[PDB]
Enzyme design. Structure first.
Site, PDB file in Angstrom:
ATOM      1  N   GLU A  45       0.816  -1.210   0.000  1.00 44.71           N
ATOM      2  CA  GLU A  45       0.000   0.000   0.000  1.00 44.71           C
ATOM      3  C   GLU A  45       0.853   1.266   0.000  1.00 44.71           C
ATOM      4  OE1 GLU A  45      -4.096  -1.572   2.172  1.00 44.71           O
ATOM      5  OE2 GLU A  45      -2.621  -0.436   3.342  1.00 44.71           O
TER       6      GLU A  45
ATOM      7  N   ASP B 234      -7.614   7.544  -2.826  1.00 47.03           N
ATOM      8  CA  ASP B 234      -7.502   6.134  -3.180  1.00 47.03           C
ATOM      9  C   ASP B 234      -8.136   5.865  -4.540  1.00 47.03           C
ATOM     10  OD1 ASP B 234      -7.146   3.329  -3.060  1.00 47.03           O
ATOM     11  OD2 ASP B 234      -9.138   3.091  -2.169  1.00 47.03           O
TER      12      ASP B 234
END
Ligand SMILES: O=C(O[C@H]1CN2CCC1CC2)C(O)(c1ccccc1)c1ccccc1
Ligand SMILES: OC[C@H]1O[C@@H](O)[C@H](O)[C@@H](O)[C@@H]1O
Ligand SMILES: [Cl-]
Ligand SMILES: [Cl-]
Length: 438
Positions: free
Chosen positions: A208, A217
């Site tokens: 991530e 995101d």
């Protein structure tokens, strides 16, 4: 003799470098939020001890050695020795605390790191100082009254019960040797555990990534640090709200590399908690090992526990310990197709049960990097003196006075090269110093 001015300049300069060096560290930490970490709290304590050594121990010892005797009297002599031994003990116990911290961090990656707070730190430091003092101070100052007589004369300064070599050696073992032995053993274990060093943190910062600034995101939501979900709002301030709630401070949208890891551990702990309170996920989590448990946590991180729960079939294959088939089955998901790379590593982790699917950082942590130098410096500078004590046990004439003096100055200068290490093993400390001089 006539060359006094030289000695005074040298010792004076050395003491100056030491005091301005540690004060520079203490300030660097106090004034820079980026340098404010539990690890640096330990270094802060060390800096205090080392500061006192620079102002008191070095100077008074120089006086005592240049002048040939002790001119200041018994009371100031006793305070001087107490101070020296009390802070020295504090130092070694701080090294111990750091060691225990590393041990737990390495051995308990999931549970431990979350409970490392500024409060626990300050309390462990408090215990260290208080405990050290309690041990040395009373004995050193009041031993004369205990026995009823003072063996120390008016021109000399030394610990009274140390008159017997055996007692001095014994004390060396308990105060110096044993803690060193213990630090060796648990660092041996730390070595064993970290031989191929990847942990859930490294794993998730690879998958991530690690961003210190709010990044939208792929789903379109607000996120921070290592894939930490904030809010769904199109208004940044809506996220800044949740963020400043997690940080407890007005970040303006930007946090530090340390607050990121503090949030990370919070997510991990919370992650595990929810998994255990989850009926579909609990059984497989119970059966898995540390590495495979991390892989699972990774999945919960990405798709959430409700998503991971959809993998009941593959999960059951994991509980059956059929790794290759579990992998084959996992690759049939669209998750595998939408995030190939990350999925492959996590699945592979499930497959092998090792970290071999993940590449090491190639640059060691600042904390481990610093810790190593601290230990090296500590042992290399203190061993001479202590092995001097050992040898002194069977043969006193073997060790001349000039040798003892060298031993003393080694132990002393170790308080000088500490800030040097912080600056060399940590670019932020060096930077801060640089800006602090101006
Ligand atoms: O290294 C030692 O003594 C040095 C520390 N200070 C004061 C005496 C010398 C020089 C600097 C130390 O091993 C020691 C030395 C002599 C006898 C017993 C122990 C020590 C002392 C206190 C706390 C931790 C270790
Ligand atoms: O369970 C793990 C999750 O916990 C939440 O508290 C965090 O916001 C998520 O970023 C994290 O992935
Ligand atoms: Cl805290
Ligand atoms: Cl780092």
């Amino acid at each position: 003799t006539f060359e006094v001015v030289f000695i005074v300049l040298v010792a004076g300069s050395l003491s100056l470098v030491t005091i301005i060096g540690n004060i520079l560290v203490m300030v660097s930490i106090k004034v820079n939020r980026h340098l404010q970490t539990v690890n640096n709290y330990f270094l802060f304590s060390l800096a205090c001890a080392d500061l006192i050594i620079g102002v008191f121990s070095m100077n008074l010892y120089t006086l005592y050695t240049v002048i040939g005797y002790w001119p200041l009297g018994p009371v100031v002599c006793d305070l001087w020795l107490a101070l020296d031994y009390v802070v020295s003990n504090a130092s070694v116990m701080n090294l111990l605390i750091i060691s225990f911290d590393r041990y737990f961090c390495v051995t308990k990656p999931l549970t431990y790191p979350v409970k490392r707070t500024t409060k626990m730190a300050g309390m462990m430091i408090a215990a260290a100082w208080v405990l050290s003092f309690i041990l040395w101070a009373p004995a050193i100052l009041f031993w004369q009254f205990i026995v009823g007589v003072r063996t120390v004369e008016d021109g000399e300064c030394y610990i009274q019960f140390f008159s017997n070599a055996a007692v001095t050696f014994g004390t060396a073992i308990a105060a110096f040797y044993l803690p060193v032995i213990i630090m060796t053993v648990l660092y041996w274990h730390i070595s064993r555990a970290s031989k191929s060093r990847i942990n859930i943190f490294e794993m998730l910062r690879i998958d991530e990534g690690l961003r210190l600034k709010i990044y939208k995101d792929t789903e379109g939501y607000y996120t921070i640090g290592i894939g930490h979900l904030l809010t769904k709002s199109p208004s940044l301030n809506a996220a800044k709200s949740e963020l400043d709630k997690a940080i407890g401070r007005n970040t303006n949208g930007v946090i530090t590399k340390d607050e990121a890891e503090k949030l990370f551990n919070q997510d991990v702990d919370a992650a595990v908690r929810g998994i255990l309170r989850n009926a579909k996920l609990k059984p497989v989590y119970d059966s898995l090992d540390a590495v495979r448990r991390a892989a699972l946590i990774n999945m919960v991180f990405q798709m959430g526990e409700t998503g991971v729960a959809g993998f009941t079939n593959s999960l059951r294959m994991l509980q059956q310990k059929r790794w290759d088939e579990a992998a084959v089955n996992l690759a049939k998901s669209r998750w595998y197709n939408q995030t190939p790379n990350r999925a492959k590593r996590v699945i592979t982790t499930f497959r092998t049960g090792t970290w071999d699917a993940y590449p090491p950082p190639s640059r060691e942590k600042k904390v481990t990097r610093t810790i190593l130098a601290i230990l090296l410096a500590f042992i290399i500078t203190w061993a001479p003196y202590n092995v001097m004590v050992l040898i002194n046990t069977f043969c006193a004439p073997c060790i001349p006075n000039t040798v003892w003096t060298i031993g003393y100055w080694l132990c002393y200068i170790n308080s000088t090269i500490n800030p040097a290490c912080y600056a060399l093993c940590n670019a932020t400390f060096k930077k801060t110093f640089k800006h602090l001089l101006m």
